[PDB]
Design a protein around this ligand. Structure first.
Ligand SMILES: c1ccc(OCCNCc2ccco2)nc1
Lengths: 300, 237
């Protein structure tokens, strides 16, 4: 069980850790988050009380280093940093724990939600979507645009998701126009899975990361990517059976976790109705179709 | 973007453009079977691909053999159309290729755009105009070459005959769309109007009769009357 200490909390902020959140008051004696489960990536995220503009946060994995948060009054945000002195870090955390100045990661024993949302998400793949190679952790915020968004403006601050475009020469082979457009199996299995992602685990990892950035930061390009990666599978007549079964589980837990009051902006009516009711895979997502119908029947 | 009344003179500028109409590609007769069920029998069709500035019509005849053994023919017809427009553009010299293709039905957008992804500088556009190009098969010589075809064939026509020697392409297109709207609203009457007078003939190398300028004004007036009427007889007005 690892720890992310805070130097201090000088501005009033709502802090998120994975699917949990709590409020910290201005100059409240708060020194971080303890009992963080090892074995998963995590995200620690922030919404200032005075400017709800820009949710921002950091993806990290406690196995990769000792990380802490410190507010920067010049740039005006809580920054993640790596502490390279292991003994200094252990000593800081032990003092803050002794004084009970840390919130406990509040995981219920029965609860597999975070595992289920991050099953295929790996830090190494996050760091290739979010390029900042001098840090072991990755910053994301509400405003960051994707590489494909920039093709349609600072490249250093982009989300390098895999570009998917159904009306493109990568997605369509010469002479297979109608075939490849109406059945995207070629594009899914040969171009993306065999060629780009190498396996379905990496594809699912990017799909899950895109969803989580959409949900936690309201990142619009991430929402676009999530829906495109779903539509590409649903629009393929030929999909490995294990992929369909796993997709149904992935989406079930994403829909379960989505805040009810964000469904209007985070769910694309066209994609979901097409996937659940018109697509090749309309009969292959039983768990997802049942939670969607019981939770968001209005969308459909 | 979409083509409508606000940008109608764009059709007659010097940027090469083609209209594509697919309404006569997949044509059927519906009939009863011996067991009392219903079946379709396909008949020859055509793609209507027209340069509105020059009058050049690229009429690709769609022979019924292209449907043999195929499923979902109404959907295939749009993709077949797109693939036929795609070969036509590819055969044209670069300086003759269009800068825009305007489809008369929005369901042709995605098939044509997927077929021309390797031609990114050609704009594929819908239109809000209700153009009467379906009535092309009411032009006797066009219908004749389609129905006689025994194999796929491209036939080239100028749908304006020699009119551009005396009128502008705006006026020629307006005349064409009036003639076709008439033929579409009441084919018998429209055809009576066009041939009532035996002294006016259709040249062997033309589609329409050899009217003088004054006779065209008469004819055009008669077609307007036909259309306004039928619209009465239709709506009781
Ligand atoms: C008939 C004759 C030639 C031909 O060339 C292939 C061009 N098709 C466009 C495209 C999609 C993806 C790549 O290129 N297609 C049909």
């Amino acid at each position: 069980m690892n720890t992310v200490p805070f130097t201090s909390a000088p501005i009033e902020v709502t802090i998120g850790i994975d699917q949990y959140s709590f409020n910290v008051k201005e100059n409240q004696p708060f020194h971080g988050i303890k009992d963080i489960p090892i074995g998963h990536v995590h995200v620690i995220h922030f919404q200032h009380a005075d400017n709800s503009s820009m949710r921002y946060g950091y993806w990290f994995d406690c196995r990769m280093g000792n990380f802490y948060i410190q507010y920067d009054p010049k740039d005006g945000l809580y920054k993640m940093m790596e502490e390279r002195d292991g003994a200094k870090f252990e000593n800081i955390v032990h003092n803050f724990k002794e004084r009970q100045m840390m919130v406990s990661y509040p995981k219920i024993d029965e609860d597999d939600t975070w595992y289920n949302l991050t099953e295929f998400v790996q830090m190494d793949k996050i760091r290739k979507i979010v390029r900042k190679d001098e840090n072991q952790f990755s910053y994301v915020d509400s405003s960051m645009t994707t590489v494909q968004e920039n093709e349609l403006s600072d490249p250093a601050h982009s989300l390098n998701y895999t570009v998917i475009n159904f009306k493109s020469r990568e997605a369509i082979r010469p002479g297979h126009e109608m075939e490849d457009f109406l059945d995207k199996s070629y594009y899914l299995n040969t171009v993306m899975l065999q060629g780009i992602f190498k396996n379905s685990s990496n594809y699912f990892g990017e799909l899950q990361f895109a969803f989580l950035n959409a949900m936690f930061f309201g990142n619009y390009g991430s929402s676009l990517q999530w829906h495109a990666m779903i539509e590409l599978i649903c629009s393929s007549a030929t999909v490995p059976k294990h992929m369909l079964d796993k997709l149904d589980e992935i989406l079930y837990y994403q829909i379960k976790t989505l805040p009810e009051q964000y469904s209007d902006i985070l769910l694309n009516e066209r994609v979901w109705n097409i996937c659940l009711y018109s697509s090749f895979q309309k009969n292959s997502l039983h768990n997802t179709e049942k939670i969607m119908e019981n939770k968001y029947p209005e969308l459909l | 973007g979409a083509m409508n009344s606000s940008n109608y003179a764009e059709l007659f500028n010097n940027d090469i453009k083609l209209f594509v109409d697919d309404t006569n590609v997949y044509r059927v007769t519906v009939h009863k079977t011996f067991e009392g069920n219903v079946a379709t029998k396909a008949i020859n069709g055509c793609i209507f691909t027209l340069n509105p500035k020059t009058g050049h019509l690229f009429l690709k005849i769609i022979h019924t053999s292209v449907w043999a053994g195929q499923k979902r023919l109404s959907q295939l017809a749009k993709w077949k159309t797109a693939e036929e427009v795609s070969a036509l553009v590819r055969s044209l010299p670069k300086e003759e290729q269009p800068k825009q293709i305007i489809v008369t039905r929005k369901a042709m957008l995605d098939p044509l755009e997927v077929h021309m992804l390797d031609f990114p500088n050609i704009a594929i556009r819908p239109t809000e105009l209700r153009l009467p190009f379906s009535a092309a098969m009411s032009i006797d010589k066009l219908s004749d070459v389609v129905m006689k075809a025994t194999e796929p064939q491209m036939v080239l026509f100028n749908i304006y005959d020699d009119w551009l020697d005396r009128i502008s392409s705006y006026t020629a297109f307006s005349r064409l769309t009036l003639l076709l709207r008439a033929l579409k609203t009441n084919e018998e009457s429209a055809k009576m109007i066009l041939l009532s007078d035996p002294t006016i003939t259709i040249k062997s190398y033309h589609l329409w009769p050899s009217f003088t300028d004054e006779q065209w004004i008469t004819i055009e007036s008669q077609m307007r009357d036909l259309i306004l009427t039928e619209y009465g007889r239709k709506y009781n007005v």
